[PDB]
Amino acid sequence: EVETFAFQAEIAQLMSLIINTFYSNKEIFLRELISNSSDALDKIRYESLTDPSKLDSGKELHINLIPNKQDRTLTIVDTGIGMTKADLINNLGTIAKSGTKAFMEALQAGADISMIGQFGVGFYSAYLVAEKVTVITKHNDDEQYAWESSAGGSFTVRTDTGEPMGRGTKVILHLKEDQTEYLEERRIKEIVKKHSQFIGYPITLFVEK
Numbered sequence: 001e002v003e004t005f006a007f008q009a010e011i012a013q014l015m016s017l018i019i020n021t022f023y024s025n026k027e028i029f030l031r032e033l034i035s036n037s038s039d040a041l042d043k044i045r046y047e048s049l050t051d052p053s054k055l056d057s058g059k060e061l062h063i064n065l066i067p068n069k070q071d072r073t074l075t076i077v078d079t080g081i082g083m084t085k086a087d088l089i090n091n092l093g094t095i096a097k098s099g100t101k102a103f104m105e106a107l108q109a110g111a112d113i114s115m116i117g118q119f120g121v122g123f124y125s126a127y128l129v130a131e132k133v134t135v136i137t138k139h140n141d142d143e144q145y146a147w148e149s150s151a152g153g154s155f156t157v158r159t160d161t162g163e164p165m166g167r168g169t170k171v172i173l174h175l176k177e178d179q180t181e182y183l184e185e186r187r188i189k190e191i192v193k194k195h196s197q198f199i200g201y202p203i204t205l206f207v208e209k
């Protein structure tokens with residue numbers, strides 16, 4: 001059972017701008033997704049200071065980067081607080097609406113795409129390099145869900161029957177055919193070292209077999 005939803009008009013406009021605009025500095029997608037993972041891990045860490053049982057679904061707080069050349073996917077996994085069904089349908093889009101309006105006003109005033117994180121909508125930079133994005137997430141208070149969008153104005157949500165995650169978020173980037181450089185180890189290492197060197201969680205870059 002798969003539910004299909006329309007993005008709000010403003011978010012569809014931002015995604016289309018990100019996919020169509022000529023912008024060479026695409027590597028900032030990884031900084032934005034890692035930053036999103038680090039915020040999610042801060043949240044579950046804080047909540048567990050006053051409620052240690054919130055870590056029953058997983059004590060480890062980390063980030064894993066997994067390239068897969070056979071599937072042409074780059075996966076960013078965190079064990080953060082994860083996302084509920086309401087987040088995927090309502091809450092994230094509500095905050096992304098005003099962040100998108102501020103971001104697009106700044107772009108006409110001279111700002112550039114690399115500042116997208118300053119407006120809270122850094123996740124959409126994944127469409128600089130991905131033709132489709134799948135998100136598997138599990139929050140302590142809800143079930144495991146799969147979110148997916150190839151842009152074009154819509155996204156889907158379904159209950160995930162795959163491997164149980166425990167807690168956290170998995171962002172699967174189905175890469176465009178001409179962005180496979182972000183599957184190379186030496187390239188991911190360079191981006192992480194340059195943009196995410198001080199993240200206060202262990203970042204493990206997996207190697208391909």
Ligand SMILES: Cc1cccc(Oc2ccc(N)cn2)c1C
Binds near residue numbers: 007011093096
């Ligand atoms: C994981 C994540 C974080 C922030 C935004 C985001 O996109 C979304 C998600 C849901 C709706 N309604 C609109 N944009 C995603 C997938």
